[PDB]
Amino acid sequence: MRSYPAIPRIYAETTLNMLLKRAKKPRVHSIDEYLKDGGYQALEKALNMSPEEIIDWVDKSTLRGRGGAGFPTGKKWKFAVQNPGPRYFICNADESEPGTFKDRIIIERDPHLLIEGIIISSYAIGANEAYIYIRGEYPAGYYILRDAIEEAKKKGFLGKNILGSGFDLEIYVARGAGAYICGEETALIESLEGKRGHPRLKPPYPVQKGLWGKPTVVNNVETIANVPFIISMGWEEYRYIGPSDYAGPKLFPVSGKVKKPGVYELPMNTTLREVIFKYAGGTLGNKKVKAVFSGALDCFSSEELDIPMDYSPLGFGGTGTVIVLTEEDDIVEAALKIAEFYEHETCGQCTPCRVGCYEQANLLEKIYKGEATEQDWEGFDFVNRNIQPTSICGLGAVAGRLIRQTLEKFPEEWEKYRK
Amino acid sequence: FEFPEELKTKLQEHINYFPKKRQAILLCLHEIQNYYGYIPPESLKPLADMLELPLNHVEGVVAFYDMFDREDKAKYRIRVCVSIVCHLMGTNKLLKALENILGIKPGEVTPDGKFKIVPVQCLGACSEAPVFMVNDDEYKFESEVQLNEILSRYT
Amino acid sequence: KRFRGAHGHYVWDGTEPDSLKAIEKFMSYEKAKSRCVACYMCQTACPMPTLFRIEAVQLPNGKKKVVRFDMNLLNCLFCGLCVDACPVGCLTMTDIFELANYSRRNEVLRMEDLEKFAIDFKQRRGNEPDRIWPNDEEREKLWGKIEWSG
Amino acid sequence: KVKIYIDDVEIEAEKGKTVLQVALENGIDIPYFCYHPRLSIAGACRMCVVYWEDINRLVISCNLPVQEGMRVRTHRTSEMVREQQKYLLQALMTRHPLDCPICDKAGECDLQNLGAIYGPQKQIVPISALEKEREEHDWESDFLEYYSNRCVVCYRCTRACDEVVGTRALYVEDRGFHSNIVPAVRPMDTSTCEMCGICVHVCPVGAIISKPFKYWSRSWLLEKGRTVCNLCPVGCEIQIEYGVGDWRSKRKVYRTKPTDELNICAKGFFGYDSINHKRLLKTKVGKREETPGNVVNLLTTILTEHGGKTGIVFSAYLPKEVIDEVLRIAKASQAYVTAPQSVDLFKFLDELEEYDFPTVKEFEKADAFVFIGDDITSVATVLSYYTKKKVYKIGKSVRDEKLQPEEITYEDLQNLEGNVFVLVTPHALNGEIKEVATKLKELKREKGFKVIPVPKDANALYLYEVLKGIYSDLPAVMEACERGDIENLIIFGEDILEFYEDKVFEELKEKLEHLVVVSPYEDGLSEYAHIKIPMSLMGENEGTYKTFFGEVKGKKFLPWAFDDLAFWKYLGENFKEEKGLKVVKSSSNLRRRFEPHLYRNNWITQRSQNLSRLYEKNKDITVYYE
Ligand SMILES: Cc1cc2nc3c(=O)[nH]c(=O)nc-3n(C[C@H](O)[C@H](O)[C@H](O)COP(=O)(O)O)c2cc1C
Ligand code: SF4
Ligand code: SF4
Ligand code: SF4
Ligand code: SF4
Ligand code: SF4
Ligand code: SF4
Ligand code: SF4
Ligand code: FES
Ligand code: FES
């Protein structure tokens, strides 16, 4: 289509002008504008390099995955080319964690930056078939990607013998249908095979046996958008962006009680306090910050605002999601929304999570309504602390993480709910 | 039960697009649901035949994903985000407005079958909370009057 | 109140425990009739199972109906193990003890009898509290006025 | 081949096995739900957690292959494992109802057993017994009932339906806490489901219930025995659960179960009631019970003085030992011997001249399968659980469609290549018996295919081995009765009713001097007899059968059993020297009166009240897949 569905005007700001160079403006940037802006030249440079060199530059760039696990991209690619092909490359555009809207502004505004990164990466691991798995609730992004891919094929960037390099590639776009678990590497692959989204037991890992049991690489949209910059700038040049260890630009979706909610492109040495007050404009009504929710994973209190937004132990971590809560917001009520979220997304494959998430949310609901008894409390604790040990995947492993942290950082607020 | 030509062609495009037919199952279920306003249980066998898949496989898939609806028929699904950020910014105000305009609560569908309110998890537009969708279009809730003008554009 | 007398079958009167009400949907019962669901826990727990005789059927509507429940008190230990095993609050020991009779046959309780015993026991001492003895005048002959306390 | 440690105890384990397998083999009980030795590994219940010291992490043992020198710890020496067992069992019990008093699984329930041994011992998550709900849908079946709140979603049923039976009749309805099992097509009783009861048996709890068994008893009040199922030629080993007539349970068969090999079909699972139906358990003369010794004298007189005018109609539902004794007596009486299988099976095997009869285990060696004749899944059902290679077909195809068979022609067989197993059902060749046998005989010599005859009756192949060259044609025997050449008939079972209608025997009772019927039932063909002699059913005799699972020997444990073999052997004490035989042959073509069906394949399953309901619903259906 040439007229896409309606999407909100998400505000975007940047201090590096790399990933949001074009995405800072709320509109589609088609191939003609992207080319005038220098697009696809990084792909031609990469195609004049061997696949092994490209993997090497990505490893030396020290780029880590922006999907939440922080695994080093270059090493993931090296693991995949350890086994014989055919190989597959998958772009993970599921993006369904609460407060995370960073990937959509790239897809909806600069799809060619993502397409170029997919091509370079596919060439690097020797994948002639690449997939983009985008959540079902992103219809504009779906049509936009489909059309941008068609523009690329017309210009010769996709298809057979790309730019005379002998390299063949086709990018298929898959749509989800409402499941946060499909963002999990193996569940996505299962969904891509036309099955229910249940995560697989690992080992094996997808880099050895993934889509159709063949070596598959799954990378987050943000991670891939970095690949064109790594080739274009050179790996050495890229590594100097930000702190020595956590290099590269990073997208931060800031939401909640802030004046300027939106996506911010900043270096990972920035502190959470700088993110909220320096870039997002402070809090609404200038109310005091009570807590910050790293998506549905972590909970930071007002006493932890001076930490770096990196992948270090004492750092923010996660995917950079910043949900700001002020002094008039109820933590218990907030935890309930989190509990309801995990109950709604547990896939149901394994016991600790299938039942833990449901009973955790039901118990917290009784606590919140004031109908909780002493055994209800003891039971709430028991469940919250035992969902993770035997869970199969990351969902069950963190379904009680944030709620537990609010119990330790805001005990006074929780005891206000005891009879 | 047979698929009308218009819908059958769309389904064939998806089935021929992917390298393997079964990979088109989610796009086909979307196509069916957008055509009939719901996924008629009577279409799973015809779809499973086009994909060369056993019926129980197709049934298991359509049962797993949240967007698919085999019970209620609605021309427009009003997906309302009830997750943390939108809840903090006014999801309740939006639901109350939807009730004042259409007389329905989450999960219900108007008598003529025009609208159905569907509560959903984070829609990925938290910076523009409260968010809601009208089948494919995403909007920010501003006021009851504003919501009424937006809803008047459908039917 | 804790006397282990003649057995009885508590009846469907509205004061049933959560466990029985939870399975009521599966039973074919009548108001003011035995609560028994024929689980065989009493007889299985009993060291003398031969004294029991329980029978239940599956009605054509799918519900379960108890059709026979007999106990021979002359081979009973009056031990109370069966009441412990009743998961539905049906089997109980009443205060009935004047059962001497002229034939082994008069010492065999049928379901109809178990119901009548329990109905009468509940009718006369259901709200009575769990005390060491229920009447002090009958005990005064031997003990006298006892200085009770809270 | 590999040494490991479980709670610091050295244990030798064959490489390729899992820690859970090794532990169970060595008597180390580790609680588990979703692992089943016959199904693929699932790793979903997580109840089999063990602490793997080598990696300092909790791991599921059902998926942990043994490695040289590995060290694991179970709940015996690990509190971490103990805490997770209590949590997992408590989680399962959260919405599990207080249904034990009326649930059919009580006493043999994995949740009830494990929950009492490793569970929380008290309620930690306080849920009222009145709020024990989970999403649920009626299976719309008269035989199976699903209780989703009792379900501990373990996926054993789904795996068994897809990997063992292959019918693909179940699916998991909407995800998460409320994941519930639903039949792919409802009403279930006429869907692709073959009502084999395997889902009932693999279910670790009372989630999937057998309606015929509901509320009639309690699992711990029944007796148990294992024997050979003789309802078809496969030879499955099944377990009969029965009562004796004491305080625990009535003197009858209450239900039946497969073993952990999951070798069972609907006939074997729901046909148990044919054992209780109108049994003939005493020798009778007319309508009056008579002592066996007196009946033995009558028969001794009949065969000694009138053997040359006596015909014996064998049943393929007789064990080898009885067949042999009767045949030996016949050869001592100069009688006529036949079997209804002489109409089709014997004519075919006579032309084929040499066949193959490998065990089910040997089916692994085949590259492809060719089904010729009837619907194999309706004749020897369990065989369809082992024909997992390419399947070609010539003939009727109804339930066999689950194997996605490719239709071919006899001319195409010449081009197949490599270790082909041809499974042919002679009762379905209608006039092309000799032609088909001749064609397969060429194929067996030129290309070397395996030609395996699939009889529809349990011991028909042994009957053929022992009767070849000397059997009379069934129509010739009947024709000889009308002519008066045969004055006495000893008929075993009702196999004969597949070719002649009842009226024929009502008239034969008048025409014959002696009509002796050897049957397990007081109704049917035995109603027309002058002398009725009991015939044993499964679990009532120690007889061997030549089946697809080998030469299997049954066990005698049902207490009301009539000693079939002892009676015949006693009669045989009056016959020592071999006198001869008489053979009658005739070209008249007898047509089978009815086609076997998955739920009714012989006169025994016909007397099953359960299978009769299933048969009446599906008798007209001919298409289940498309
Ligand atoms: C419950 C769950 C949800 C996830 N969701 C996403 C997601 O929405 N987007 C994403 O890129 N990765 C998601 N992941 C992480 C993927 O498993 C995987 O680690 C990542 O996509 C790999 O790409 P990367 O190396 O570039 O980070 C999720 C993981 C879990 C356990
Ligand atoms: S932990 Fe939760 S999401 Fe992960 S497999 Fe288990 S049930 Fe599914
Ligand atoms: S234990 Fe109770 S419910 Fe069970 S059979 Fe005995 S009296 Fe009836
Ligand atoms: S009182 Fe003791 S001996 Fe008598 S029936 Fe009960 S359990 Fe058996
Ligand atoms: S499934 Fe087991 S634990 Fe649940 S009610 Fe039945 S017997 Fe009891
Ligand atoms: S009983 Fe057997 S055939 Fe029927 S649904 Fe269960 S596994 Fe499938
Ligand atoms: S019905 Fe039984 S076998 Fe099937 S998932 Fe539930 S507990 Fe497991
Ligand atoms: S396949 Fe034959 S032997 Fe096996 S259970 Fe069924 S009827 Fe019996
Ligand atoms: S929370 Fe409503 S859109 Fe993310
Ligand atoms: S038995 Fe190992 S996970 Fe279920």
Q: What is the 3-state secondary structure (H, E, C) of D402-417?
A: HHCCEECCHHHHCCCC
Touch between chain C and chain B: 3 or more Cβ pairs under 8 Å: no
Q: Are residues B68 and B78 in the same domain?
A: no
Helix (H) or strand (E) holding D18: none
Whole-angstrom Cα distance, residue A243 to residue A310? 9
Identify each DSSP E strand in A48-156 by its residue range: 87-93, 127-134
Query: Which atom number of ligand 7 is nearest to the Cα of residue D150?
Result: 7
Report whether residue A232 contacts ligand 1, using a CB cutoff of 6 Å.
no
Residue D202 sits at φ, ψ, to 5 deg, of: -75, -20
Q: Are residues B87 and B57 in the same domain?
A: no
Least distant ligand from the CA of D207: 7
Q: What is residue D424's three-state secondary structure?
A: strand
Q: Are residues B50 and B5 in the same domain?
A: yes
Helix boundaries (H) for A174-316: 185-192, 221-233, 235-239, 272-273
Residue C75 sits at φ, ψ, to 5 deg, of: -120, 15
Residue pair A289/A306 in contact (Cβ under 8 Å)? The answer is no
Q: What is residue D544's three-state secondary structure?
A: strand
Find the CATH number of the domain harbouring C48: 3.30.70.3270
Helix (H) or strand (E) holding D127: none
CA nearest neighbour of D340 among D433, D235, D477, D229 = D477
The domain containing residue C30 runs over which residues? Answer: 6-126
Technique behind the model: X-ray
The sign of the torsion formed by the CA atoms of D532, D533, D538, D539 equals positive
Helix boundaries (H) for A215-298: 221-233, 235-239, 272-273
Residue C90 marked in a binding site: no
Whole-angstrom Cα distance, residue B154 to residue D530? 86
* Contacting residues for D186 by C-beta, under 8 A, at least 6 apart: D138, D139, D140, D141
Residue D71 sits at φ, ψ, to 5 deg, of: -125, 120
| β-strand pairing of A249-256 with A322-326 | parallel
Whole-angstrom Cα distance, residue B132 to residue B118? 9
Query: Which among C40, C51, C52, C96 is the best mutation to test ligand 4's pocket, defined by most ligand atoms within 8 Å of the CB?
Result: C51
Residue D16 sits at φ, ψ, to 5 deg, of: 110, -20
Give the distance from CA A145 to its chain's centroid: 18
Residues β-bridged to residue A236: none
Size (chain B), residues = 155
* Whole-number Cα distances in Å, A268 to A64, A66, A230, A274: 12, 12, 17, 11
- Whether chain C has a CB inside 8 Å of the CB on D128: the answer is yes
Domain annotation covers residue C50 = yes
Q: Are residues B2 and B63 in the same domain?
A: yes
| Strand ordering across the sheet containing D390-395 | D406-407, D390-395, D368-373, D420-424, D450-453
Token pair of A7 as six digits: 């999407």
Number of domains in chain B: 2
Token pair of A114 as six digits: 């993502």
Give the distance from CA A302 to its chain's centroid: 25
Q: Which residues of D touch C19 (CB under 8 A)?
A: 98, 101, 129
Domain annotation covers residue C140 = no
Neighbour-count burial for A302-335, b at 16+ CB within 10 Å, e otherwise: eebbebbbbbeeebbbbbbbbbbbbeeebbbebb
Torsion angle (degrees, nearest 10) of CA A275, A277, A279, A283: 100
Domain annotation covers residue C19 = yes
Helices A351-369/A331-345 angle, 10° precision: 150
Whole-angstrom Cα distance, residue D218 to residue C41? 10
Indicate the residue type of A371. Answer: E
Residue pair D268/D605 in contact (Cβ under 8 Å)? The answer is no
Residue C67 sits at φ, ψ, to 5 deg, of: -115, -15
Report whether residue C78 contacts ligand 4, using a CB cutoff of 6 Å.
yes
Q: Which residues of A touch D64 (CB under 8 A)?
A: none
Closest Cα in chain A, distance from residue D258 (Å): 28
DSSP class of residue D524? G
Give the distance from CA B106 to its chain's centroid: 14
Domain annotation covers residue C37 = yes
- Domain end, chosen from B26, B43, B72, is at B72
Q: Are residues B79 and B27 in the same domain?
A: no
Helices D433-446/D345-352 angle, 10° precision: 30
Q: Which residues of A touch B139 (CB under 8 A)?
A: 6, 8
Residue pair A302/A410 in contact (Cβ under 8 Å)? The answer is no
Q: Are residues B86 and B153 in the same domain?
A: yes
Query: Which chains pack against A, by 3+ Cβ pairs within 8 A?
Result: B, D
Token pair of D546 as six digits: 């030549």
Q: What is residue D25's three-state secondary structure?
A: helix
- Whether chain B has a CB inside 8 Å of the CB on A138: the answer is yes
CB atoms within 10 A of CB C133: 10
Residue pair A1/A83 in contact (Cβ under 8 Å)? The answer is no
Helices D564-572/D320-333 angle, 10° precision: 20
Token pair of D614 as six digits: 């299933």
CA nearest neighbour of D252 among D32, D561, D16, D506 = D561
* Contacting residues for D57 by C-beta, under 8 A, at least 6 apart: D51
Q: What is residue A21's three-state secondary structure?
A: helix
Number of residue pairs across C and D with CB atoms under 8 Å?
57
CB atoms within 10 A of CB D85: 26
Q: Are residues B91 and B103 in the same domain?
A: yes
Helices A102-109/A139-154 angle, 10° precision: 40
- Whether chain D has a CB inside 8 Å of the CB on C138: the answer is no
* Contacting residues for D351 by C-beta, under 8 A, at least 6 apart: D433, D434, D437, D438, D441
Give the distance from CA D392 to its chain's centroid: 25
Whole-angstrom Cα distance, residue A350 to residue A287? 42
Whole-angstrom Cα distance, residue D421 to residue D369? 5
Q: Are residues B15 and B77 in the same domain?
A: no
Whole-angstrom Cα distance, residue D45 to residue D49? 10
Domain annotation covers residue C131 = no
**Is the preceding peptide bond at A86 cis, omega within 30 degrees of 0?**
yes
- 């009765």: which residue's tokens? D481
Whole-angstrom Cα distance, residue D484 to residue D510? 12
Residue pair C118/C9 in contact (Cβ under 8 Å)? The answer is yes
CB atoms within 10 A of CB A375: 13
Please measure the distance between the N-terminal and C-terminal CA atoms of chain D and give it in whole angstroms. Answer: 49
Whole-angstrom Cα distance, residue A336 to residue D299? 85
Residue pair A280/A264 in contact (Cβ under 8 Å)? The answer is yes
Q: Which residues of B touch A365 (CB under 8 A)?
A: none
* Whole-number Cα distances in Å, D223 to A351, C143, D220, D240, D256: 35, 56, 8, 8, 11
Q: What is residue D334's three-state secondary structure?
A: coil
Considering only CA atoms, give the Rg of chain D.
Answer: 27
- Domain end, chosen from B51, B72, B93, is at B72
**Is the preceding peptide bond at A204 cis, omega within 30 degrees of 0?**
yes
Domain annotation covers residue C61 = yes
Torsion angle (degrees, nearest 10) of CA C86, C90, C91, C92: 120
Residue D481 marked in a binding site: no
* Contacting residues for C147 by C-beta, under 8 A, at least 6 apart: none
Residue pair D604/D317 in contact (Cβ under 8 Å)? The answer is yes
Whole-angstrom Cα distance, residue D97 to residue D264? 30
| β-strand pairing of D531-534 with D514-519 | parallel
Closest Cα in chain D, distance from residue B49 (Å): 8
Residue pair B107/B77 in contact (Cβ under 8 Å)? The answer is no
Neighbour-count burial for A10-33, b at 16+ CB within 10 Å, e otherwise: bbbbbebebbbbbbbeeebbebee
The domain containing residue B140 runs over which residues? Answer: 73-155
Whole-angstrom Cα distance, residue D264 to residue D286? 38
Helices D460-467/D320-333 angle, 10° precision: 30
Domain annotation covers residue C150 = no
CA nearest neighbour of B47 among B22, B68, B65 = B22
Number of domains in chain C: 1
Token pair of D325 as six digits: 């004794």
Whole-angstrom Cα distance, residue D169 to residue B54? 9
- 């080998």: which residue's tokens? D550
Interface contact B56-D173, CB threshold 8 A: no
* Whole-number Cα distances in Å, D390 to A309, D359, D365, D369, D439: 58, 19, 12, 6, 21
What is the residue with the minimal CA distance to atom 1 of ligand 7? Answer: D207
Q: Are residues B90 and B66 in the same domain?
A: no
- Domain end, chosen from B48, B72, B96, is at B72
Whole-angstrom Cα distance, residue D146 to residue D526? 41
Q: Are residues B66 and B49 in the same domain?
A: yes
Looking at chain D, after which residues does the C atom sit over 2.5 Å from the next written N, breaking the chain? none
- For D98, half-sphere exposure in the C-beta direction (CA atoms, 13 angstrom radius) is 18
Q: What is residue A41's three-state secondary structure?
A: helix
Residue D362 CB burial class (10 angstroms; 0-12, 13-18, ≥19): middle
Q: Are residues B92 and B40 in the same domain?
A: no
Residue pair D242/D223 in contact (Cβ under 8 Å)? The answer is yes
CB atoms within 10 A of CB D358: 14
- For D450, half-sphere exposure in the C-beta direction (CA atoms, 13 angstrom radius) is 18
Residue pair D443/D352 in contact (Cβ under 8 Å)? The answer is no
* Cross-chain CB nearest to B60 (options D169, D172, D626): D172
Q: How many helices (H) and strands (E) does chain D have?
A: 17, 26
* Whole-number Cα distances in Å, D97 to A142, C23, D45, D147, D348: 45, 9, 19, 10, 58
Q: Are residues B79 and B146 in the same domain?
A: yes
CA nearest neighbour of D556 among D568, D538, D544, D569 = D538
Residues β-bridged to residue C92: C8
User: Apex CA D85: angle with CA D84 and CA D86, to 5°?
Assistant: 90
Neighbour-count burial for B69-102, b at 16+ CB within 10 Å, e otherwise: bbeeebebbbbbbbbbbbbbbebeebbebbeeeb
Whole-angstrom Cα distance, residue A84 to residue D376? 42
User: Apex CA D38: angle with CA D36 and CA D39, to 5°?
Assistant: 70
* Whole-number Cα distances in Å, A381 to A364, A386, D127: 10, 9, 15
* Cross-chain CB nearest to B55 (options D173, D174, D184): D184
Query: Which among D96, D132, D151 is the best mutation to test ligand 5's pocket, defined by most ligand atoms within 8 Å of the CB?
Result: D96
Domain annotation covers residue C144 = no
- 């007196």: which residue's tokens? D294
